[PDB]
From a paper:
A key component in the generation of cellular metabolic energy is the F1Fo ATP synthase, a biological rotary motor that converts the proton motive force (pmf) to adenosine tri-phosphate (ATP) in both oxidative phosphorylation and photophosphorylation. The enzyme is comprised of two rotary motors, termed F1 and Fo, that are coupled together by two stalks: a central “rotor” stalk and a peripheral “stator” stalk. The Fo motor spans the membrane and converts the potential energy from the pmf into mechanical rotation of the central rotor that, in turn, drives conformational changes in the catalytic F1 motor subunits to generate ATP from ADP and inorganic phosphate (Pi). Here we have used cryo-Electron Microscopy (cryo-EM) on detergent-solubilized cysteine free [name] ATP synthase13 to probe its structure and understand its rotational dynamics and coupling.
Focused classification of rotational State 1 highlighted five sub-classes, here termed Sub-states 1A, 1B, 1C, 1D, and 1E; with resolutions of 3.1, 3.3, 3.1, 3.2, and 3.3 Å, respectively. However, comparing Sub-state 1A with 1B-E shows a ~36° rotation of subunits α3β3γεc10 (corresponding to the F1 motor plus the c-ring) relative to the Fo stator. Importantly, this rotation describes a ~36° movement of the c-ring in the Fo motor without any corresponding rotation within the F1 motor: the α3β3γεc10 subunits are rotating as a rigid body relative to the Fo stator, with the movement mediated mainly by changes in the peripheral stalk. Sub-state 1A was in one rotational sub-state (here termed Sub-state 1’), whereas Sub-states 1B-E were rotated by a single c subunit relative to Sub-state 1’ (here termed Sub-state 1”). Thus, across our maps of [name] ATP synthase, the rotor (consisting of the subunits γεc10) was observed in four discrete rotational positions relative to the Fo stator: one in each of States 2 and 3, and two in State 1. In State 1 the un-stretched spring corresponds to an Fo rotation angle in-between two of its 10 preferred rotational sub-states. These two correspond to the observed Sub-states 1 and 1”, which have similar quantities of stretch (close to 1/20 of a revolutions), and therefore also energy stored in the spring. The maps presented here were generated from material imaged in the presence of 10 mM MgADP and all showed the enzyme in the “autoinhibited” state, with the C-terminal domain of the ε subunit (εCTD) in the “up” inhibited position interacting with the F1 catalytic subunits.
Residue numbers in the entry:
A (entry chain H): 3 to 69
B (entry chain Y), N (entry chain X): 1 to 52
C (entry chain N), E (entry chain O), F (entry chain S), G (entry chain P), I (entry chain I), J (entry chain M), ...: 3 to 79
D (entry chain a): 4 to 269
H (entry chain R): 3 to 78
């Protein structure tokens, strides 16, 4: 697992440890597993999938941002 | 054929070969040496004046 | 009997080149399609449509050559 | 003087050897068979530079002061800088031999190539019309034997460093296991690594030989074919280009020598 | 006649090279077409237009060779 | 004897060229399949079951040239 | 034979190699044109004009052989 | 007579073209495999699983060619 | 006689190769030029300027391969 | 006679092709390996392990062909 | 008679391959020159100097191929 | 005798092909080394290290072919 | 001089292949050098150092190819 | 080309020129340059030691 943050100019939105996440990157759908190499991309407005450790899937709605 | 003409052509070629060098090759090569000389004058004097 | 045996060399120098051209073209195009799908999974069918519509033009002149090759190797041989 | 173009261009291939067995200058028309026939034109002329090297460096090395240096001393320090700034980047082992070795190779190979920039026929002209003898060509690097001799030498040094620096027990493990590191491949690994070893000196020498031989042969051509007043238009640009090559060959040779030696010793 | 086989061979050669060329060129161009389509799906008809446009040049030369090959294989041979 | 040997060479050119076409074509196409794979390990089954489709198009013509090359070498001999 | 018919062969070589040249030289540039378009959906006309300029610059030297093979077949042979 | 050597030319043609195809194809494929691995280093086992599966498709035709070349050389 | 009629193969080789050398060469070179435009549309004519400069170097050898082929077409044969 | 020399021509073609294949294949593979390393040098040993695992697969066929070159040049001879 | 053909055939292949090599190499290189230019245009002349310094080493061997080629046509007929 | 006439050609090919292979392989392999260096300088020692490690494996078959070609051109011929 | 005419084809094959190989290898390597420079002009001298460092390897075979081809062209022939 | 014993002869002159330069030239110039570097490095170092 790895440590994920979702933050905004105003307030934090998520912090904790995760197994994978799936994000609709600006240039295409994308999925992060632990140890992923360094990367930097914009993302489109839409949901992202977190699977918290033990496999507790979750959804969050993001109005945009940078990954 | 004639032998002596070949030396003539070789001379015409060789002088035109050297002429470009002494106006486009050697001036930069010596300019780098001047750069190094200036540098070392700088590097030593700028420490002697720190001894001062 | 040379004009008989040589026609198989003709058929070879038709079919092999046709095959290479078709395979390379379709591999390139299908690779671009495949990564497109890998990015935009919802648009799989929409891209599949265009892939077939476009591949239809690549397959055009290999099929001419393979037709003439089959003609030579059987219809005259 | 019935020199035809096709013939004049054929004469140029010929060295001025002397039979080791019989002290005979080997005439161009009949070439004696033997391994004992020194090429005299590329050997004495090669050590000409072997001496004009030391005699042009020794005549500062003693004289220098660490103060402001003269212009000649400035060039000499610029060349030591080029060399040492290269060597320091890739060989970490402080073995003294590698450091001055590269200096020799660089400067000597540069000087060997440099002779070829003088017009081709002139030295042969003087050397036959005054001194009479039957042959002359003046580029030591354009004789395979010098290049493969240097290659064999560096090859010896390679193997020595492999022994001294990791011994036979490491040498054998490398030659047996690589690249797959398992027994089931070894009988093939054994051929591969030896092949690679032999290629290093082979390529090192032959690259230089081919470069300089092909560069010389163009000048050999034009100086006999075109109308003699015109020969400049295709002798000049070629030399303009050639200078870059004669320098790059010395650079490549030096740096690859450093690289392979470091690769064996480290 | 021992030299009709040479005409079979010449036709086969020219057509096989035309096939390789046309297939590969169209494959490249279509690959980029599918990439562009995957990015901007609401532009697929606009770029598909130009794909049809430029595609012609990718075959305007090869079709010459193809016609000549048919010609020799049936009109001459 | 005379009327046999060159047929071996005819089969060779076909089965040779057919190999290069199918190997590279599947090579390129397989690459983009892996390129998409790492971006989305979750779609690895959906893409796999997409790779196999177009993979059938590329290997179409080559398999023609394989069978026909075999025909010459064993059925024509 | 060898006076008359091998002229057909060499012209087939000309117009096969040039057939490769036109197809690939145009396919590459056309793919770059399309991808540029997809990046800049407003600039299709500008880009297509520049494309036709360089297009002619490309096809000029193949077209030599394009005419030359025909001349050989129908004026030399 | 011609029966002996020419056959081995007919072999070497297929053999060499098969080497070309297999080498270049596995090259491309493994290049993409290594870049994908350098992207997602921890999923290497799954990527390798799929890699060998797709690879098996590439050697098919080259392996036919080599199987036949072996016959052409040895059996005749 | 065989020679002059066979020499026409030499020009087909000599200039057929140059045809694709120049065609693919600038095909690549132009492809980059177009993208420099699609990124810097306010910079095209500068990029076109330098494009013309280098574009000369590409075919500089094909020039003499073509011309020498024409020397064989008419002067030698 | 030819029953000697054409064996050497066959050996030359077989080993030349095998050499081009192995060299270019490993060049592509190693290139992608290099950039993968450059983006994160701390993985290097793992990438190298998988690099060897694959570079083995690359060589299987070329190293057959190379050995058959010797079987020709020293058993058929 | 036959003797004086292979000289022109040799020049043909040698100079066609010289043209291909030069055109492809320098097209590849000029593509990156134009990339850089369109990415740092105020830097052009420096990178053009570097481009020429590369081009020299690129063209080192092809031009010797051209020289040794015309040698066969005019120094040995 | 006839042996002198074929071996100097067989070796020629056997080594020109290895030339092509090693040249293209190393060009490609070094390209990624340069791009990686320009991306992340000061990793240059490590890139150069593992570059030379890999490059050693690219030369194997090309150099084997060169060796056997020479072993033929002189020791056999 | 049937024996001799094959030698002036052998030199042609050797050095034509060497030409293509070396030219394209250096083209690729220099292209990567050029884009690296355009990224980091104030690295240009170090990247030139490295370009010359590796380029010496691309010539390793193709010069040997000239070394033997030209030798045969002028010492054997 | 036909190899010749000169391949054996040349190696001797090579190794001799290496043996000579190795000792008669290189350490000399190594010192001649290192001394010039150290004299500047120490100047600025001691000047910093003064300012502190």
């Amino acid at each position: 697992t790895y440590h994920l943050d979702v933050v905004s100019a105003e307030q934090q939105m998520f912090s904790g440890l995760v197994e994978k996440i799936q994000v609709t990157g600006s240039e295409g759908e994308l999925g992060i597993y632990p140890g992923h190499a360094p990367l930097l991309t914009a993302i489109k407005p839409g949901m992202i999938r977190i699977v918290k450790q033990h496999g507790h899937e979750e959804f969050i709605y993001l109005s945009g941002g940078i990954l | 054929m004639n032998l002596n003409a070949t030396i003539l052509g070789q001379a015409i070629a060789f002088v035109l070969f050297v002429l470009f060098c002494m106006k486009y090759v050697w001036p930069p090569l010596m300019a780098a040496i001047e750069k190094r000389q200036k540098e070392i004058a700088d590097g030593l004097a700028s420490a002697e004046r720190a001894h001062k | 009997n040379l004009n008989m045996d040589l026609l198989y060399m003709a058929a070879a120098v038709m079919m092999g080149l046709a095959a290479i051209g078709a395979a390379i073209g379709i591999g390139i195009l299908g690779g671009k399609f495949l990564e497109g799908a890998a990015r935009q999974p919802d648009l799989i069918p929409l891209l599949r449509t265009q892939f077939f519509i476009v591949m239809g033009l690549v397959d055009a002149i290999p099929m001419i050559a393979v037709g003439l090759g089959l003609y030579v190797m059987f219809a005259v041989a | 003087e019935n020199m035809t173009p096709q013939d004049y261009i054929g004469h140029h291939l010929n060295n001025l050897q002397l039979d080791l067995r019989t002290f005979s200058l080997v005439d161009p028309q009949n070439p004696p068979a033997t391994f004992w026939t020194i090429n005299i034109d590329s050997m004495f002329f090669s050590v000409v530079l072997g001496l004009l090297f030391l005699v042009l460096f020794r005549s500062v090395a003693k004289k220098a002061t660490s103060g402001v240096p003269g212009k000649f001393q400035t060039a000499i320090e610029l060349v030591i800088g080029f060399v040492n700034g290269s060597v320091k980047d890739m060989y970490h082992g402080k073995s003294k031999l590698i450091a001055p070795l590269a200096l020799t190779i660089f400067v000597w190979v540069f000087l060997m190539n440099l002779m070829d920039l003088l017009p081709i026929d002139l030295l042969p002209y003087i050397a036959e019309h005054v001194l009479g003898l039957p042959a002359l060509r003046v580029v030591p690097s354009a004789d395979v034997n010098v290049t493969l001799s240097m290659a064999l030498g560096v090859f010896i040094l390679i193997l020595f460093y492999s022994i001294k620096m990791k011994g036979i027990g490491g040498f054998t493990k490398e030659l047996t296991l690589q690249p797959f590191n398992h027994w089931a491949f070894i009988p093939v690994n054994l051929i591969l690594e030896g092949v690679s070893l032999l290629s290093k000196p082979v390529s090192l020498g032959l690259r230089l030989f081919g470069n300089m031989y092909a560069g010389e042969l163009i000048f050999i051509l034009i100086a006999g074919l075109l109308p003699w007043w015109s020969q400049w238009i295709l002798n000049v640009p070629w030399a303009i280009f050639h200078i870059l090559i004669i320098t790059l060959q010395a650079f490549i040779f030096m740096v690859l020598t450093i690289v392979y030696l470091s690769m064996a010793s480290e």
